[PDB]
Amino acid sequence: KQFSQEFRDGYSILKHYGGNGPYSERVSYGIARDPPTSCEVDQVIMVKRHGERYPSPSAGKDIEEALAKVYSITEYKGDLAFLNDWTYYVPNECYYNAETTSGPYAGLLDAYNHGNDYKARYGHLWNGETVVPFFSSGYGRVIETARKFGEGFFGYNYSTNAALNIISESEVMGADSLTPTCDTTTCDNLTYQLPQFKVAAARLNSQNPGMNLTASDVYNLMVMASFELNARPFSNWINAFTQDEWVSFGYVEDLNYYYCAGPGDKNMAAVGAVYANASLTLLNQGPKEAGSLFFNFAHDTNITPILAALGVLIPNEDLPLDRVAFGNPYSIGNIVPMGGHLTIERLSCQATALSDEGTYVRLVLNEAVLPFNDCTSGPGYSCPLANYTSILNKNLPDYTTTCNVSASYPQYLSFWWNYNTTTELNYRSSPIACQEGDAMD
Amino acid sequence: KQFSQEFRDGYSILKHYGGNGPYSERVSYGIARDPPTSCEVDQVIMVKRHGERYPSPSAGKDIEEALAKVYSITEYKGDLAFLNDWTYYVPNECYYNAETTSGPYAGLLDAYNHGNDYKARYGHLWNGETVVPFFSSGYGRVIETARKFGEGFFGYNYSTNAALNIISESEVMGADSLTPTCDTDNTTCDNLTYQLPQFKVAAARLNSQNPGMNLTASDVYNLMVMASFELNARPFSNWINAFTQDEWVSFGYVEDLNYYYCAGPGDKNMAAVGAVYANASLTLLNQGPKEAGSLFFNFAHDTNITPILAALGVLIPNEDLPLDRVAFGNPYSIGNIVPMGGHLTIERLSCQATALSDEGTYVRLVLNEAVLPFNDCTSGPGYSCPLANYTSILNKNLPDYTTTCNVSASYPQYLSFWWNYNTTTELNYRSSPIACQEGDAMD
Amino acid sequence: KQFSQEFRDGYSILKHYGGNGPYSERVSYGIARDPPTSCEVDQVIMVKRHGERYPSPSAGKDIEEALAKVYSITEYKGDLAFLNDWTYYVPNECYYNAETTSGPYAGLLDAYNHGNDYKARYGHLWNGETVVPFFSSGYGRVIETARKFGEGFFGYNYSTNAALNIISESEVMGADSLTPTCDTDNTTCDNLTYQLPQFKVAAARLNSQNPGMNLTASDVYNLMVMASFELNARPFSNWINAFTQDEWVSFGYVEDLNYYYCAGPGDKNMAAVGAVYANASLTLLNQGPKEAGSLFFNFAHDTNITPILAALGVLIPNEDLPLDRVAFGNPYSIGNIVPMGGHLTIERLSCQATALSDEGTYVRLVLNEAVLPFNDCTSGPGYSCPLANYTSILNKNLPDYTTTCNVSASYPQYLSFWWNYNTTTELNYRSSPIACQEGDAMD
Amino acid sequence: KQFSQEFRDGYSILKHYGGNGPYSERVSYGIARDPPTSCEVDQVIMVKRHGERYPSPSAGKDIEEALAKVYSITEYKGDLAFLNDWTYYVPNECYYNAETTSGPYAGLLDAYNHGNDYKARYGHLWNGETVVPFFSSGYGRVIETARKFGEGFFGYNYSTNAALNIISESEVMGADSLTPTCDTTTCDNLTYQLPQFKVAAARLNSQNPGMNLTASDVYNLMVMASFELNARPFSNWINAFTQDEWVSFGYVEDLNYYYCAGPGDKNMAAVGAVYANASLTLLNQGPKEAGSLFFNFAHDTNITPILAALGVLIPNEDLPLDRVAFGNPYSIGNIVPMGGHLTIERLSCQATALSDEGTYVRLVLNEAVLPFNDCTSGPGYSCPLANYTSILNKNLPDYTTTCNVSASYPQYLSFWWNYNTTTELNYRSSPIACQEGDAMD
């Protein structure tokens, strides 16, 4: 038969852990991913989150405390029986914050694979002679992701024809940043708890008495289980919780993004307007003038403000804190999983039975075409560049004003137009610092 | 590795043809389908649409006219090359309206498969002795679906322990119906164009590959209607391949608009029509399995299930669907609501106390094998709704049917067949040929 | 990307339980299943095994004794924890031998599904007027499979245009049989141990997790027999999960040995038994569809299909299978030969000339949906065998049945039912209850 | 339901093109891939073929000639319609022989992915402090594969703790080689033709008249289509041929291996005995003495002689040249596809209900456990080390004698015991030479 009648994607745990675990393709609306007939991509502007990593130091501290309670007791029973032959996956505390480098979901493998992939898809946009600059925010795991992606794309010519430019995450950069700063609630008050965690705590304690696990330990043990895939092919800890518990966990993580780095915080659109507006400039200037390939690397919390700025994936009302709002668009596993990315494709199209010859804008989020709301008149439900321009011009909030940015800091982004072509930053030249975070190499 | 990183379900054409083609499992929110730990289903109330069928007579007329234009020209080229060795799938015009009986997607096979399946899942709710009445609306394809489902469920004991009760589709039945009537003294549905820009691209591409057909955007619509129905009789359809992924996305949406406005939230009277079933089933839930019975298998149409969903206030778009463009992401995706053989199953859960709930009765809704959370009432095990809350919500929100629908005072004002039925098995097996284009029927 | 790099089919438990569990498509060599370009099937001769069933009475007795030991002990631990909420799937002992009627793998659902499927594939071979006789051996579960297949294929016209002919399994039928008899005046089969080392690992692991059952390697064998049969009545089996992948690999092989030696090439008389069908069908192929008829649907047992494969000289291990270890990679993998509902379909192809063959008649063999090349005779389109060569090969290699099997001269020496049959439809529907443990039957 | 009833793996084109195309997991007998309960791997000896590459210069010449005939004619029709918007995938002739670096099947991505994978599976065999040498035969694409695998496995410590040793392919190395030489028929006479190629030629010519394609052009166009995946995610050329044509093509390629580098040539077992015997030595010495990780890289034609030497996957009779011998064990897509590999795992097992405590040998070919014929008495159908030793000692042919190896050449392999720990060869330091073949860097 032609089509399968089973539809099981929704059950995947990959779509139920916020952005802690492995990358996954965003659920598609059914729109063909390749350029519509009569069109071709003439410019690409992408922002990819660092790949799969180890937990952060604070998350690791909490995971360790929960594991201490687990470990305070003879041979394990029930769903925790695997614990009799199991070792925590973080080599040592200095690895917290770093990209993973083992298993099918390794973060560096993610970046490399994505680069090789984009080479086939957009190779036609590089003549094999030009030196292409690529950009990374100044943070270890992000830089390492950028490096492996660039190496995947440029391959044999990575050393000579790709030029890594690292942009400081310091606020001093103002709007000339991949990680804009904004200074002057619900986010601070999140409990990270939902009733299903009580069921898990009760079930775990009952199978192996003596751990005194709370709903809070459950939350951290699930954070732990979701990060395990980033370093290993399978996680037995994932199996110690139920499908319904994972559904609640993913939602707890969705709330964090929504309120701390999304539409739940009204200043996020202004932060995301920096990239939204600067990229609009590149689209309007065109590939011949500005360049055809812009590969950017940053964090999950830098992509969500862009989506907010663009007005896409905006829940109709703020997400409720005490229950799962099923079906809302803010499903983080389809927005910013490890290695997630927003790719803006500029399409050069000839006339079609539904559109005039011209330039169109197409958005792709994690391999799935994301229609620009009601602007879907061009080929493949794209948006005519002129309409796209009026929409952003009319709706993007002002960054410096909204964010009280010092008049002495750069007021607009320049790196896409003012960059270096040297290749010294392409390869790492020093060990990964202990829990390395901010970095410029 | 543990999980696949590819997510392709959204591309399936089965989710892009409204309710014309084969049945498909509804896209899941991830909630476990089986009863939560500490719970068990003690009562089941299901309403299933007839299985996969041939087009209706009017649709067939249109399909045939479009095919005449296709056929008005030497060996076919391009994507229509398969037409050189292809025959329309409707045996003859008398088959329009009937359930299909060939291929992996055959309508009767769907019903029988669904019955065998429910036997394993809910067999514990039948003691092997009781004679269980099951209900079908008075329409040929619906009756045939009911019969095959019942046979799948009761199996060796279908002729003795299942009792088919057929409920007339006539308005004279008032609320004692599986297909309540509502007078039309009150529009967007009548003005639907069934057109979107992508159809122009298809027409242009088809005409260019095989000149001389003069196919229009309308012919394309009907040719797509035809392609979607083909799967109902055959395992593969090459016609599906003659249109692009983007064309199918538009077609599915054109079909969603029909349901939305003709049989859904787009028509404000649909909630009242659906309140009949919603309220009557609420009565069975509150009465309980011991008193009322534990198994209620009902069979009707797609347009009988959508008003129930509207009545319950689930899958309600935030705003009426726009007619001129695809409103991507809206909940009204018909391939996940009423595909051929689609169904809404209400499970009553008897649960012991859990770390998050008291011992008690809970209500779970399952639409096409996917648990459908009752909006904000998700406090019970498996995101279910406490029976008491479920009761207040329906009592507070269900519109009045007879009032809203100006039902004659002389017609039944209440549904009774779930309590007043026959246990004879005389209607279990078909006893006459399928009439030409058989629609309304009582056998 | 275009193709997946993961190849997991080999791990499926469906391919590791001999013929006890659900039907599965045979592993393909990659040859296209549909008729080659320039060809079409003009005649079909199929023999299908009864669908998924409950264990036999003797197997059930053994399963029950093993379960008694399991049950001789407080709440279950480890892999047997599910036993705290589990009930044996055989309703009562009178169900042993019967076709299953619940779950996605239900035996009757299998038959009905297969029929609907063949309707789309071979419908063109029935003009909608002719009354087609179909044949079943005289055994309850086989008859019930035949009936459901026929109903799936003929659908709306099953009661009028299909004619079930039931052929007695008695030896008195001689060669005019779907289940020929062969006297046993002549062993390895009788001495099979049904044991392999992995069963010791299972027993040890099970006893250690829940002490007090004293399960042996034999109990493990029967518990695995039980687990494999569970799928026949239910969608999932937790018992399957209590054994390792390596244990299942050994179990499947223990089952392969049974067929090999009791009903296969391991017994030199099986080719002669299978020659009856092989030769009679060759006659139909040579006679042609116009004269003999185009559709021959036959239903029998797994042990009736394996002798045919032996007679045809296909899937013959290079050496007899070793009894003490798994001979990995040998062609005698029963899950790819006779799983529940398994079938051998002979398609006669009428082909025009192709760049590699002359216009003519070719013979194609399909085993469980996979084209099975006739050894070195693969010169026709789609690796088929020219009818003339097929004829010489069978004529030259098929053993003589009556001689080899010492068949009384007073019994039919030739199969005739394909030419001498009834067209009445009286046997199409079951008219009495399924007898307790119903085996031989003529209705 | 628990299991799918559809079994479609056999139809995959990945299993129907000899060793020209993308890597694929070998079809499994069902044996669990992980170490049996009571056992653990204490030593790994692997030989992996270079990853996906571009055709060789000679193959490329032929592909080009066939494409010239295709291109000798207005807009393309039928199955070749994609040709109206298609470009050959070899950048320029200097790329022939090289590893691919684009698409999901890129050869370097293959190596990197495999390394990350083995890190999770065998990481426990490296203490994070030791410098592990790894070996590659002296050939460009093989060296590049070795490098990316080593980088995947050692990750952050690749520069310091992995030491690439490159072994010359010159015959002068004698038995101290990953590519032993042997000098003094059916192989030379292979036609590379089967009737199905006539059907394709006839069908292609009929759809686009004027190309005058022969059964020979068809063969080369299929060689071309199979190599296309190595550089791109999809190949439309694959779709221009039928399933039955691909079945014949794969068999034509199987014949080549069988007769030119397999059991069809009686000297192949002697060539493979070098590795078979040397590795047996490592197994008998053990991990504590010899080392626990041996990652080797060579060619497809170096792995087939090892399998021949071991007596595994030996057809009961020589493959017929004029027809497909369906079901024979010599299915190259399950033996040596691009990046294929033979991994020997030494298992240290405690006593089980079926075996004594001890050392066992397990063979894994392309992720599938390959039982050692009738020696399957240990856990997971493994072979007791002692039995494995007697079998090889009793059956391996003599290399130097059989192959008339000069007494002045090394008579036994030494590199596994005599190697360097320097890391200079770890990273490429010069451009990829035009059609680079033999290389020592």
Ligand SMILES: *[C@@H]1O[C@H](CO)[C@@H](O[C@@H]2O[C@H](CO)[C@@H](O[C@@H]3O[C@H](CO[C@H]4O[C@H](CO)[C@@H](O)[C@H](O)[C@@H]4O)[C@@H](O)[C@H](O[C@H]4O[C@H](CO)[C@@H](O)[C@H](O)[C@@H]4O[C@H]4O[C@H](CO)[C@@H](O)[C@H](O)[C@@H]4O[C@H]4O[C@H](CO)[C@@H](O)[C@H](O)[C@@H]4O)[C@@H]3O)[C@H](O)[C@H]2NC(C)=O)[C@H](O)[C@H]1NC(C)=O
């Ligand atoms: C495989 O790859 C992995 C990843 O690349 C490699 O792992 C990395 O290896 C790095 C070493 O090369 C290791 O770096 C060490 O981390 C230590 C912890 O740092 C954190 O705490 C301190 C103190 O609070 C903070 O200052 C710091 O910012 C962090 O928050 C550091 O302590 C180490 O620093 C010392 O060593 C480096 C040189 O290696 C010096 O440049 C530095 O100045 C320090 O030297 C002092 O300490 C050393 C002894 O460690 C003395 O010998 C030296 O004389 C100095 O001692 C003075 O100060 C100390 C107190 O610190 C005091 O005791 C003494 O009396 C003196 O006053 C160093 O930075 C990475 O963390 C690690 N990354 C990961 C992710 O694990 C791995 O090595 C590779 N494997 C192989 C086999 O190569």
Ligand SMILES: *[C@@H]1O[C@H](CO)[C@@H](O[C@@H]2O[C@H](CO)[C@@H](O[C@@H]3O[C@H](CO[C@H]4O[C@H](CO)[C@@H](O)[C@H](O)[C@@H]4O)[C@@H](O)[C@H](O[C@H]4O[C@H](CO)[C@@H](O)[C@H](O)[C@@H]4O)[C@@H]3O)[C@H](O)[C@H]2NC(C)=O)[C@H](O)[C@H]1NC(C)=O
């Ligand atoms: C396989 O199974 C299929 C499905 O059951 C059978 O097909 C049906 O066969 C019946 C006949 O047995 C067909 O019925 C015939 O319909 C004709 C057309 O009916 C329409 O038009 C009339 C007149 O306007 C209306 O009255 C009617 O409501 C319909 O709108 C009728 O003209 C026929 O009537 C004649 O025959 C009957 C007796 O059979 C007399 O009573 C009449 O007086 C008159 O002389 C007849 O009723 C039916 O349409 C078919 N259904 C389908 C879906 O095709 C096949 O026959 C069966 N195959 C075999 C070999 O048995």
Ligand SMILES: *[C@@H]1O[C@H](CO)[C@@H](O[C@@H]2O[C@H](CO)[C@@H](O[C@@H]3O[C@H](CO[C@H]4O[C@H](CO)[C@@H](O)[C@H](O)[C@@H]4O)[C@@H](O)[C@H](O[C@H]4O[C@H](CO)[C@@H](O)[C@H](O)[C@@H]4O)[C@@H]3O)[C@H](O)[C@H]2NC(C)=O)[C@H](O)[C@H]1NC(C)=O
């Ligand atoms: C759902 O459908 C199932 C399957 O059809 C029905 O179950 C069958 O029901 C029949 C009864 O209708 C059962 O038949 C009974 O079998 C008993 C045991 O038979 C064995 O033992 C006797 C004696 O040694 C042998 O002669 C025989 O060959 C068997 O080996 C018989 O003792 C019964 O006989 C009594 O009743 C009949 C009339 O019904 C009289 O003629 C007799 O003289 C005697 O008084 C009887 O024949 C059958 O075994 C069941 N099959 C299965 C698989 O369980 C269910 O009944 C049906 N459910 C409902 C609610 O209808």
Ligand SMILES: *[C@@H]1O[C@H](CO)[C@@H](O)[C@H](O)[C@H]1NC(C)=O
């Ligand atoms: C948008 O960004 C571009 C590039 O930094 C800048 O030149 C331009 O002034 C910005 N426009 C607005 C309205 O901020």
Ligand SMILES: *[C@@H]1O[C@H](CO)[C@@H](O)[C@H](O)[C@H]1NC(C)=O
């Ligand atoms: C709901 O339906 C039941 C059954 O028909 C009926 O008895 C009851 O009166 C109805 N309730 C309301 C409010 O209409």
Ligand SMILES: *[C@@H]1O[C@H](CO)[C@@H](O)[C@H](O)[C@H]1NC(C)=O
């Ligand atoms: C083969 O079977 C046919 C049909 O029964 C019979 O007529 C014929 O004589 C048989 N041929 C041989 C050699 O037994």
Ligand SMILES: *[C@@H]1O[C@H](CO)[C@@H](O)[C@H](O)[C@H]1NC(C)=O
């Ligand atoms: C035909 O019917 C007669 C009478 O019922 C029966 O005896 C005979 O066995 C039937 N023939 C076949 C081939 O079944």
Ligand SMILES: *[C@@H]1O[C@H](CO)[C@@H](O)[C@H](O)[C@H]1NC(C)=O
């Ligand atoms: C096997 O190889 C080892 C390592 O090179 C060598 O020492 C030994 O002599 C060889 N044995 C035989 C029989 O050739």
